[PDB]
Amino acid sequence: KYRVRKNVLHLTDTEKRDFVRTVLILKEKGIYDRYIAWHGAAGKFHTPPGSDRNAAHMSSAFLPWHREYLLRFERDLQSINPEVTLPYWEWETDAQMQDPSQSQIWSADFMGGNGNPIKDFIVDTGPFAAGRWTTIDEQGNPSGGLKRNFGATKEAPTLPTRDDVLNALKITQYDTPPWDMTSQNSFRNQLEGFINGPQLHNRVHHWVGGQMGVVPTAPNDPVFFLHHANVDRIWAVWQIIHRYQPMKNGPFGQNFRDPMYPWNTTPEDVMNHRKLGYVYDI
Amino acid sequence: KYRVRKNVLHLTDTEKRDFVRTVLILKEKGIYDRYIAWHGAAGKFHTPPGSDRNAAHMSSAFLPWHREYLLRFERDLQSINPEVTLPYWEWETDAQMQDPSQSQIWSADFMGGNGNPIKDFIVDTGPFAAGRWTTIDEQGNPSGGLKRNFGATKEAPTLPTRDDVLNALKITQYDTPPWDMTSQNSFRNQLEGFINGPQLHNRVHHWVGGQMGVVPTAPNDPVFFLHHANVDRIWAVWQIIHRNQNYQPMKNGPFGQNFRDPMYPWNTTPEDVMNHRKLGYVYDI
Ligand SMILES: [Cu+2]
Ligand SMILES: [Cu+2]
Ligand SMILES: [Cu+2]
Ligand SMILES: [Cu+2]
Ligand SMILES: [Zn+2]
Ligand SMILES: [Zn+2]
Ligand SMILES: [Zn+2]
Ligand SMILES: [Zn+2]
Ligand SMILES: [Zn+2]
Ligand SMILES: [Zn+2]
Ligand SMILES: [Zn+2]
Ligand SMILES: [Zn+2]
Ligand SMILES: [Zn+2]
């Protein structure tokens, strides 16, 4: 319970400072990249081979897989600075502002601005400007800087609304067969964003564009973790009123007690975020 | 000390059949695939980025990485069957054979036959012939079945010889700066086979050909594990021979490479697997 993830808009200037600062040590030491590669590899790992499913997406493992990813990440954050926790970007309310692109979250004193078209959309403001922050594609080779493109598509021109979220929290079943994209009536698939997609989680990705728009190169952007803290919390919160599928008869690595490549972690090991050691602002 | 690792030519027919069975069981569950990916994963993980080194190859972590790779595999074989251990293929001895392809390892009751040129090289014999054994390519997707290409390359027509192993075993440094393909007088890069290459470890990867000849898909071939047990066995022997020489780099090497660094995709460090006895096994020698 006793470790609290706040709303970014609740953070003090010293917190945003410690966060942004602590994240650079991790990039520096070489531990942040481990997180990029785990996530990339999880996405190549299809369950089973020949399937749309992969270990970390497009199935029930989506939520636990990412829960453990953050938990593992936040612990590393702690080792550097014990006073730091993982914040959440509450995109669903940024979505109401006349111009979400203006949300404090994008301040040069935290993550940084939208991409600079004049530089083919390389972000050139904030701590993760190209030059200060290296990035790497899918082949696992340097790529030359973070690129953002706030609502540049037509598929995802806007962030998800409070009603998109509220309407997901209403789903009875954590997940249903066939435990994939085409999963009807399943809190998992809905939050993820495939029902009339992209929505919710998926939509946030496409909206930011840049690396974030591609699963193979999403963690290259720290927003990735703020986005997923909010996803995690949506679930966390779901978990109080409805408080997993499948248990068995899912593909291997989708069941309650299966291992989640690239780890030996199981859905069950992280079903109670408090037993993990952290809570949200609520 | 208790898991004894046996030469492939010392194996009984039930031993040959216990292993094969178990590997297939691991494959049936979905555990085998996890290993293939772990390896492809590590190879795309450069230390640092922009470098030719990855977490598993081309640098000092190549040796301890695979030790941890096989240790995990063996423990998985063992849970299926308390009796199975990881056999080693002593390829330095098959190299003396008039036609290495005749060796009992490639028997149809163990690993199976070389690729068959009538079918663009797909192995149609043994327990892992295409149809009884499914493969991925380098992007994660089904590929079409195991494929073997015995010494068909100009660069790697021969298996490495015992003389070749004896030269590695000669080196006094575990590795040297800069801890990559270019490290001179380094056991690691010698055994790996980059010194006037391909040699030793690489040579054998190339000689087999097919999946086994490419980093990202090598472990699609169960012989990958037979081959690295030998590599490990040779390293373990170098460790007794040079008892007062330890791993390098001890410190102030690329993160991912130092004595005490974690090894992607794992949290295990070289320092965890430096002595095979504690890990729980021995080679019959
Ligand atoms: Cu995501
Ligand atoms: Cu993702
Ligand atoms: Cu190898
Ligand atoms: Cu390899
Ligand atoms: Zn909300
Ligand atoms: Zn809660
Ligand atoms: Zn864990
Ligand atoms: Zn023996
Ligand atoms: Zn016999
Ligand atoms: Zn590469
Ligand atoms: Zn271990
Ligand atoms: Zn061909
Ligand atoms: Zn020994």
Residue B206 annotated as binding? no
Angle between helices B31-43 and A31-44 in degrees, nearest 10: 130
Best mutation target, A31, A38, A44, A249, to test chain B (most B CBs within 10 A): A44
Question: Cα–Cα distance between B144 and B192 in angstroms, integer?
Answer: 29
Cα B172 from Cα B180, distance rounded (Å): 17
Phi, psi of B136 (to 5 degrees): -100, 160
Q: The dihedral of CA A99, A233, A85, A141: what is its sign?
A: negative
**Residue A106: CB atoms within 10 Å:** 20
Rounded Cα distance, B247 and B67, in Å: 14
Nearest CA to A22 among A91, A70, A75?
Answer: A75
Q: Which chain A residues contact residue B47 at CB under 8 A? A: 30
What is the phi-psi region of residue B167: left when phi exceeds 0, alpha when psi lies from -120 to 50, beta otherwise? alpha
> If you search the block for the tokens 């249903």, which residue do you land on?
A176
Breaks in chain A (C to N over 2.5 Å), named by the residue before each, are: 243
Across the A:B interface, residue pairs with CB atoms under 8 Å apart total: 70
The answer to whether A136 contacts B265, with C-beta atoms less than 8 Å apart, is: no
Comparing C-alpha atoms, which of A195, A147, A141 is closest to residue A168? Answer: A195
Neighbours of B235 (CB within 10 A): 22
Q: Which ligand is nearest to the CA of A69?
A: 7
Which residues of chain A make contact with B30, given a CB cutoff of 8 A? 47-48, 251-253
Which residue range is the domain that position A166 belongs to? 1-282
Single-letter code of the amino acid located at B264: Y
- Structure-token pair, residue B89: 């293929």
How would you class A217 by CB atoms within 10 Å of its CB: exposed for 0-12, middle for 13-18, buried for 19 or more?
A: buried
B147 bridge partner residues: B122
- Compute how many other C-beta atoms are within 10 angstroms of the C-beta atom of residue B24: 17
Could you say which of A33, A46, A50 has the minimum Cβ distance to residue B49? A33
Tally DSSP H helices, then E strands, for chain A: 9, 2
- How many CB atoms are closer than 10 A to CB B103? 20
Q: Output the CA torsion sign for B268, B271, B273, B279.
A: negative
Q: In the PDB record, what is the listed experimental method?
A: X-ray
Domain count, chain A: 1
- The answer to whether the CB of B36 falls within 8 A of the CB of B136 is yes
* Contact status, residue A134 vs residue B49, Cβ threshold 8 Å: yes
Instruction: Report cis status (omega within 30 of 0) of the bond before B82.
Output: no
Mutate to test the interface with A, among B69, B255, B258 (most CBs of A within 10 A): B255
Determine, for residues A38 and B142 on separate chains, whether the beta-carbon distance falls below 8 Å.
no
DSSP assignment letter at A150: T
A253 with B30: Cβ contact below 8 A:
yes
DSSP 8-class letter at A33: H
Tokens of A280: 């949200």
Ligand nearest to the CA of A224: 1
* CA-only gyration radius of chain B, Å: 18
Q: Tokens for B72, please give them.
A: 């995990």
Which residues of A touch chain B, with CB atoms under 8 Å apart? 29-31, 33-34, 37-38, 40-41, 44-50, 54, 134, 136, 139-142, 251-253, 259, 261-262
Considering only alpha carbons, which residue of chain B is nearest residue A260? Answer: B34
Residue in A73, A44, A70 with CA at minimum distance from that of residue A57: A44
Rounded (10°) CA dihedral A40, A43, A46, A51: -140
Helix ranges, chain A (H): 13-29, 31-44, 62-80, 91-94, 162-166, 187-192, 200-208, 223-241, 273-276
- Contact in structure between B210 and B146 (CB atoms under 8 Å): yes
- Contact: A41, B41; criterion CB under 8 Å: yes
* Nearest ligand to residue B108 Cα: 9
How many other C-beta atoms lie within 10 A of the C-beta of residue B6? Answer: 17
Nearest by CB: A252 against B29, B45, B134: B29
Q: DSSP state, B82? A: T
DSSP, res B282? E
Tell which residues of chain B come right before a gap with C–N over 2.5 A: none
Structural contact between residues B258 and B218, judged by C-beta atoms closer than 8 angstroms: no
Tokens of B216: 């990202």
Q: CATH number for the domain including A59?
A: 1.10.1280.10
Question: Which residues neighbour A197 within 8 Å (Cβ) at sequence distance 6 or greater?
Answer: A203
Distance CA A248, CA A1 (A): 29
Helix, coil or strand: residue B46 = strand
